[PDB]
Amino acid sequence: CEIDVILNDAESRKTAELKTEEGKLEKHYLFYDGESVSGKVNINVKQTSKRLEHQGIRIEFVGQIELFSDKSNTHEFVNLVKELALPGELTQNRSYDFEFMQVEKPYESYVGANVRLRYFLKVTIVRRLSDLVKEYDLIVHQLATYPDVNNSIKMEVGIEDCLHIEFEYNKSKYHLKDVIVGKIYFLLVRIKIQHMELQLIKKEMTGIGPSTTTETETVAKYESIPIRLFLAGYDLTPTMRDVNKKFSVRYFLNLVLVRYFKQQEIVLWRKAP
Numbered sequence: 001c002e003i004d005v006i007l008n009d010a011e012s013r014k015t016a017e018l019k020t021e022e023g024k025l026e027k028h029y030l031f032y033d034g035e036s037v038s039g040k041v042n043i044n045v046k047q048t049s050k051r052l053e054h055q056g057i058r059i060e061f062v063g064q065i066e067l068f069s070d071k072s073n074t075h076e077f078v079n080l081v082k083e084l085a086l087p088g089e090l091t092q093n094r095s096y097d098f099e100f101m102q103v104e105k106p107y108e109s110y111v112g113a114n115v116r117l118r119y120f121l122k123v124t125i126v127r128r129l130s131d132l133v134k135e136y137d138l139i140v141h142q143l144a145t146y147p148d149v150n151n152s153i154k155m156e157v158g159i160e161d162c163l164h165i166e167f168e169y170n171k172s173k174y175h176l177k178d179v180i181v182g183k184i185y186f187l188l189v190r191i192k193i194q195h196m197e198l199q200l201i202k203k204e205m206t207g208i209g210p211s212t213t214t215e216t217e218t219v220a221k222y223e224s225i226p227i228r229l230f231l232a233g234y235d236l237t238p239t240m241r242d243v244n245k246k247f248s249v250r251y252f253l254n255l256v257l258v259r260y261f262k263q264q265e266i267v268l269w270r271k272a273p
Helices: none
Strands: 002-007 016-018 024-030 037-044 057-067 073-085 091-099 114-125 132-140 153-159 163-169 173-175 181-191 196-206 212-223 225-230 240-243 246-258 262-269
Touching: 002 114, 037 057, 057 091, 073 091, 091 262, 132 262, 153 196, 153 246, 153 262, 163 246, 196 225, 212 225
Parallel strands: 024 132, 173 262
Antiparallel strands: 002 037, 016 024, 037 091, 057 073, 057 114, 114 132, 153 163, 163 181, 181 225, 196 212, 196 246, 240 246, 246 262
């Protein structure tokens, strides 16, 4: 059989992009917290010489956190069910309406290295030897507000009374297409520096205790000195703190001298239009 799911507002609803398990980019319909989710399910059952049975058909709206490479832990934080058909013969070509009204979606979608938070519609045809399942992915964004003003910040690195390097930058919070505008100042230099660079790093923490897995990724790096990091050019998502205590995503600037390093957190946020 063939299973198709179409939203009733497909023509008017915006899309966004998300990365697959393989690293590809895909377009999916974009939802916000509180929006209703409605559409049609079509199930086409090819005619066969043998009679086919099912023990129920349903559609679910699912929001869940999938933890680890082996997806050994799944945390379902929203689940809504509409039963579409009672047990019976699996036959013919049938469409079903569904509507989930004003759906709670508390967290933004996230496709990470060791975790993914995803929302989807799931159609299940219950069957004796294996259910038939089709998942229709959706994307949820969470918008933030923050004033459009500089709030300058400094970080410093080095060796007391030998090396004092300061990086001053314009904000502690940046939106995803913003620019980190800063300057390196050489306050005290009494030894020669082999190399120095500024890094933008992403830390993804997934699990707790024995479960803990921390992934650190250098998103960007940069060799009296102006520094500008154009965030639109990177695949950034908002800072996410202790999402149902299952994972965090945090961003830092890291100043590295050669080894001497200092890091400071910056908050990334998603701006509305």
